[PDB]
Amino acid sequence: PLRYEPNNRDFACNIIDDLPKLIRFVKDSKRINIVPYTQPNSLWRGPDED
Amino acid sequence: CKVPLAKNRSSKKPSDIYSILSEIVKSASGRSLKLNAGLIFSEDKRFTHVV
Amino acid sequence: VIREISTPCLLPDFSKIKSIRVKMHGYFPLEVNFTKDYSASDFFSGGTIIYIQRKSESVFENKASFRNVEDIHVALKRKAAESKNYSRGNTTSSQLVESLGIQDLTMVELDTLLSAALTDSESYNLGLLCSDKNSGDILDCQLELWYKSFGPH
Amino acid sequence: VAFKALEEDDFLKVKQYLLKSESLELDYDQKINLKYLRVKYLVKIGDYDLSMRLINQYVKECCEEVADSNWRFKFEIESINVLLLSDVGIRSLPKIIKLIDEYKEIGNPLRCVILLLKLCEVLIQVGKSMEAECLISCNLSTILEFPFVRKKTDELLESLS
Amino acid sequence: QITPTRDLKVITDELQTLSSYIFHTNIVDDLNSLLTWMSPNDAKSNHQLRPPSLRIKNIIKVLFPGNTNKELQLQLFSTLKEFYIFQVRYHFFLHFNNINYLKDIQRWENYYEFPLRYVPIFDVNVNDWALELNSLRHYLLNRNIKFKNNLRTRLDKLIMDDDFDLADNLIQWLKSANGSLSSTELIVNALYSKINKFCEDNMSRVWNKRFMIMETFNKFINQYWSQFSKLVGCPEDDHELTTTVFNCFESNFLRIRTNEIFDICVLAYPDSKVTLLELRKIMKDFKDYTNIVTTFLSDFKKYILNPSVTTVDALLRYVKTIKAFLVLDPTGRCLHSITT
Numbered sequence: 134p135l136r137y138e139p140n141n142r143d144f145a146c147n148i149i150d151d152l153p154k155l156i157r158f159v160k161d162s163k164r165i166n167i168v169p170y171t172q173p174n175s176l177w178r179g180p181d182e183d
Numbered sequence: 184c185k186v187p188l189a190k191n192r193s194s195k196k197p198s199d200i201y202s203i204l205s206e207i208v209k210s211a212s213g214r215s216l217k218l219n220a221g222l223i224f225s226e227d228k229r230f231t232h233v234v
Numbered sequence: 235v236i237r238e239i240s241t242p243c244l245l246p247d248f249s250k251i252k253s254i255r256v257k258m259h260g261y262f263p264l265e266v267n268f269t270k271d272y273s274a275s276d277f278f279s280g281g282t283i284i285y286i287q288r289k290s291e292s293v294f295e296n297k298a299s300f301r302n303v304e305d306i307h308v309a310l311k312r313k314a315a316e317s318k319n320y321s322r323g324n325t326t327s328s329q330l331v332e333s334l335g336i337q338d339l340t341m342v343e344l345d346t347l348l349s350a351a352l353t354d355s356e357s358y359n360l361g362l363l364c365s366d367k368n369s370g371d372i373l374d375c376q377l378e379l380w381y382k383s384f385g386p387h
Numbered sequence: 388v389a390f391k392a393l394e395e396d397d398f399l400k401v402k403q404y405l406l407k408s409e410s411l412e413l414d415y416d417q418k419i420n421l422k423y424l425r426v427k428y429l430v431k432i433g434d435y436d437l438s439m440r441l442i443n444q445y446v447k448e449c450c451e452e453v454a455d456s457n458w459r460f461k462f463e464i465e466s467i468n469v470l471l472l473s474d475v476g477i478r479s480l481p482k483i484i485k486l487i488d489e490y491k492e493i494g495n496p497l498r499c500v501i502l503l504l505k506l507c508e509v510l511i512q513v514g515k516s517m518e519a520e521c522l523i524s525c526n527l528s529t530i531l532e533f534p535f536v537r538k539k540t541d542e543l544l545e546s547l548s
Numbered sequence: 549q550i551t552p553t554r555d556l557k558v559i560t561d562e563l564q565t566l567s568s569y570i571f572h573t574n575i576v577d578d579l580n581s582l583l584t585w586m587s588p589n590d591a592k593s594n595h596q597l598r599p600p601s602l603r604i605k606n607i608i609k610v611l612f613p614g615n616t617n618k619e620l621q622l623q624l625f626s627t628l629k630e631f632y633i634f635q636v637r638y639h640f641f642l643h644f645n646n647i648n649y650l651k652d653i654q655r656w657e658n659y660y661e662f663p664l665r666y667v668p669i670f671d672v673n674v675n676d677w678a679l680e681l682n683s684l685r686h687y688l689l690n691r692n693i694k695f696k697n698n699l700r701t702r703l704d705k706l707i708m709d710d711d712f713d714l715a716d717n718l719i720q721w722l723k724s725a726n727g728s729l730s731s732t733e734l735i736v737n738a739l740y741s742k743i744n745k746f747c748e749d750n751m752s753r754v755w756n757k758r759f760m761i762m763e764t765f766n767k768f769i770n771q772y773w774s775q776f777s778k779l780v781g782c783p784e785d786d787h788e789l790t791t792t793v794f795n796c797f798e799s800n801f802l803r804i805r806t807n808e809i810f811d812i813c814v815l816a817y818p819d820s821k822v823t824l825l826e827l828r829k830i831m832k833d834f835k836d837y838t839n840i841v842t843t844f845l846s847d848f849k850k851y852i853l854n855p856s857v858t859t860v861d862a863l864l865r866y867v868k869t870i871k872a873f874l875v876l877d878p879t880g881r882c883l884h885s886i887t888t
Binding site (some may be wrong): 142143145146147148151 | 491525
């Protein structure tokens with residue numbers, strides 16, 4: 134587990150968070166639907182609810 | 184002679200692309216006073232009872 | 235008669251009010267007295283809301299000496315209030331500038347100026363700032379010139 | 388073209404163009420650029436009393452007449468550059484810090500780093516270059532991502548050596 | 549606090565001429581020997597913490613057994629003061645970067661004031677010696693950042709270990725210096741840290757008592773309030789300070805109970821139920837309830853919602869929390885949130 138506590142000497146701000154997250158195009162039998170993007174390995178790496 | 188009003192610099196989730204477009208297309212088609220009332224009178228339950 | 239009320243309170247009729255003041259620990263006070271020329275009704279004609287400016291808890295304000303009384307009671311209250319937000323460290327820029335050691339504005343500038351000379355005009359200028367009638371870290375300033383004038387080199 | 392001429396040190400060309408500025412009818416977006424161009428040219432010449440009195444009136448009317456924050460920021464840093472170039476940058480210390488924490492909440496990386504260069508530049512003209520080297524070293528990774536500040540960034544590196 | 553300096557060479561030449569004119573004797577060599585003894589610049593001819601011989605003491609007695617002689621002696625004392633002040637500043641500045649702890653400045657103060665007992669130059673009614681000492685203390689505080697941080701750590705260490713007399717000595721020394729690091733913040737920080745640690749030691753893992761916050765407050769007061777009042781200097785009967793201390797104790801108690809609410813409600817119930825009634829008297833803000841419910845849900849979800857846990861015990865502990873939370877919250881809105 135990484136612990137990146139906020140430090141004044143670290144000005145390396147992040148912009149990927151500000152930019153909106155991507156989406157995915159998956160088509161089922163009925164129609165083409167749009168779902169939020171998840172990394173192929175994010176299901177077992179996602180932030181756990183528990 | 185310039186009553187320059189102070190613009191309220193209000194400021195959180197970023198959400199996704201599809202949600203933002205759905206929200207805008209959906210929107211395409213007293214409250215403060217009540218808040219003040221909750222602050223004008225406090226420390227008791229008199230106002231709810233009289234209502 | 236002085237009448238002390240909370241903020242969201244109905245003040246009496248404007249024509250019968252002579253002066254109003256706001257005082258609270260924090261924001262600096264604002265007191266306005268209504269003379270015959272302008273009445274309270276005319277003053278509040280634009281709006282019944284008066285705005286207040288926020289004071290500043292700045293490190294540069296307390297360069298060397300604390301002009302503030304800094305009561306122990308209010309200090310403890312402020313510490314408890316800050317802990318409440320913290321419960322709900324070097325993360326502030328004021329601590330960064332404190333760590334950098336450039337807290338005293340005048341001392342760093344005069345230290346830079348004295349780095350080398352000491353022509354007569356600036357020498358008399360430094361003497362004038364030292365012998366100022368009222369200033370802040372005057373005693374700290376006196377020692378550097380002594381160090382610059384007669385210290386190791 | 389004039390901005391390119393300032394970088395290429397074609398002071399004769401820009402001086403003649405500034406003569407055209409005062410009697411032409413320009414759009415507001417065009418006004419500010421030439422208004423901003425005039426500030427940068429005076430900094431290059433060396434005369435700073437007129438420019439310093441001139442730059443702040445622009446920003447003061449860049450906050451009342453038009454609430455343009457981007458041009459308020461862009462105008463602000465030349466005054467920082469004017470002060471510190473005259474060997475007196477400590478006066479700018481209160482001003483730079485108000486923008487640092489202000490733009491940290493906003494999160495614009497270019498804004499934070501430009502203020503960072505001015506902060507390191509302040510600290511190196513006071514005689515405390517030791518900590519500036521320590522501070523620049525931790526953030527050196529995130530300051531090379533911006534191309535137009537590398538020339539100012541690389542130039543500071545040989546100075547520290 | 550303006551202090552004059554007239555250069556080492558000029559004052560030395562003035563001293564030699566004054567001694568030669570007034571005394572008409574060859575004590576100039578002995579005068580130079582004395583000056584070296586008081587001068588800390590040269591470590592071979594100074595005192596090095598050793599009492600002077602009979603020669604030096606006799607010269608002092610000669611120097612300290614009409615009007616023109618009196619004013620010449622007064623100016624001679626002024627020149628001696630200037631020479632001593634110049635010497636101590638140069639020596640202090642020589643070792644300025646070598647200071648990292650309070651004990652260093654006290655030993656240097658003793659090193660400087662060692663000749664003072666053997667030669668009285670500072671008048672009793674004028675506290676000059678204290679003035680330049682406070683000036684050097686102020687400069688060291690306001691120029692050496694490492695020394696400032698070391699002072700913070702040392703005072704924190706002293707207050708953690710109940711070393712109250714040295715803490716009072718440290719606080720008085722800082723107050724005399726009147727530096728940028730004001731003593732009020734250190735006292736506030738030290739007291740806050742101490743009360744937090746005392747609260748953590750006492751009211752942790754205990755829930756079966758009633759009105760225990762007053763017991764802890766009374767115990768901490770009887771154990772430390774007199775010492776703290778002596779440190780601050782405020783009267784022992786300061787009501788507002790005690791009230792703020794009590795408010796901080798109850799805030800810390802709320803924080804600890806919010807952290808431990810899972811074991812409070814799951815295991816200690818119903819033995820800890822009394823504490824719940826006390827807790828109900830304290831919570832007043834919606835943020836408190838939200839923090840409580842989210843922390844409890846995370847712990848309940850982290851531990852109880854595991855399928856590896858037997859379902860019978862799971863529902864048993866669940867309903868135990870339901871009755872526990874119902875006692876805590878008569879409204880039951882938190883019950884709806886946990887249920888949902």
